[PDB]
Structure 1
Amino acid sequence: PIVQNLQGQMVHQAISPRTLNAWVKVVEEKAFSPEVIPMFSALSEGATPQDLNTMLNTVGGHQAAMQMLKETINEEAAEWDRLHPVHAGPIEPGQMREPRGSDIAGTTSTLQEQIGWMTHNPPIPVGEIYKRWIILGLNKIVRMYSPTSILDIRQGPKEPFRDYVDRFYKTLRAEQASQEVKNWMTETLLVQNANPDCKTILKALGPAATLEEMMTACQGVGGPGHKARVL
């Protein structure tokens, strides 16, 4: 990564062994789950394309998904390469050149080139651009990998809203469907198999009311919904 005494960027500093251990743990344990992208964003602060390549190369597991990410990166970099009519590595004195698609992915450019772009005024932030391409490819894998199926889960009589809402929201979050579809889904699949006494109050209040009121209702029936880590 690149550091300086104040907030800016100037000089290179090595990647931390704790960052490497922590990064491997989330990818190996949780796999392609949406919170891994915030964790990747948090751990990749100040990172160069060489550091981002070190992070991708270090992970042993999920080898096909990493290839799908790499093919996504190759395509997105090629899309940038065709879009922007950047010239070769050679440059006139006192200018730092402009990066091509493969320079951003570190294939045709070393660490020094990456530092010269990121430390400039106004900078070219090749780590941010590569990080966006990685996030774009990770989201494609999450869309394939996460969905558990909101349609295929059903609500029994033993779980009212307070208990059911936790597993429903976890399943809904895994589902990658549009926000407009999710607005309909929220007022429909949470009343679909609800018992009629609960169904009536949940239908009346709806998703425009506070979740607290919905949780509170149906207190004399079904599972508890307030125990969190306790069964």
Structure 2
Amino acid sequence: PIVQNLQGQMVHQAISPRTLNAWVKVVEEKAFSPEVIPMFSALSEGATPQDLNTMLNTVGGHQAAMQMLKETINEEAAEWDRLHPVHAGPIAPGQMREPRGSDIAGTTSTLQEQIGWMTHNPPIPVGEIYKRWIILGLNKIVRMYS
């Protein structure tokens, strides 16, 4: 995740095993229960898209649920692109890059780009945006249940 350091900088920190252990445990016990959503949120504070994918990729099994989540993420990514259109061609200077849906999901963006966006002024909170998409998906996994 992104955290504040002593000197006021929003700096990148590695996802702790403590967080991942807690996530694995809630998925094992609460994957299809409402409680997975608050726990997901609580365990992904300041998370980059990379962190969120790390969390999701530790999910063993739950194939149908994971496909439902991926469907939702893809729908939101497609929607993002439509609501945030961009022009073709090279960006003028050496520094820039507007986030596309696949960037927010962390498939076509690097961590440094994600940090770049998240720490820009004003922030482009790609971590929070992706988190919303995941939560939308988790709500479908709960709402459709079986």
Q: Secondary structure at the match of 1:88?
A: coil
Q: What is the SS of the residue equivalent to 1:133?
A: helix
Deviations 1:86-137 (Å, cap 9, x if unpaired)? 2469533374321011110111111010000001111000000000000001
The whole-number CA distance in structure 2 between the counterparts of 1:43 and 1:8 is 23
In the alignment, the residues of structure 1 paired with residue 142 and residue 35 of structure 2 have an alpha-carbon distance, to the nearest angstrom, of 10
- What residue ranges of structure 1 are gaps of 5+ in the alignment? 145-231
Partner SS state of residue 93, structure 2: coil
Q: What is the number of equivalent residue pairs in this alignment?
A: 144
Where in structure 1 do 4 or more consecutive aligned residues deviate above 6 Å? none
* RMSD, aligned α-carbons: 2.0
Aligned CA distance change for structure 1 residues 89 and 9 (closer, same or farther; 3 Å): farther
Structure-2 separation of matches of 1:86 and 1:61? 37
Deviation at 1:58, TM superposition (A): 0.8
Deviation (angstroms), 1:9: 5.3
> Retained in 2: the 8 A contact 1:118–1:125?
yes
Segments of structure 2 that go 5 or more residues without pairing to the other structure are none
1:79 positional shift = 1.4
- Pair 1:93–1:3, CA change in 2 (3 A): farther
Relative to the length of structure 1, the TM-score reads 0.58
Q: Which residue of 2 aligns with 1:53?
A: 53
Q: What's the CA shift string for 1:186-220, capped at 9, x where partnerless? A: xxxxxxxxxxxxxxxxxxxxxxxxxxxxxxxxxxx
Going from structure 1 to structure 2, the CA distance change for 1:59 and 1:119 (only over 3 Å counts) comes to same
Distance in 1, Cα, partners of 2:74 & 2:22:
27
SS class of match (1:3)? strand
More off after superposition, 1-10 vs 127-136: 1-10
- 1:35 Cα deviation after fit: 1.6
Stretch of structure 1 that moved more, 5-14 or 69-78: 5-14
Q: Distance in 2 between matches of 1:10 and 1:108?
A: 23
Larger Rg: 1
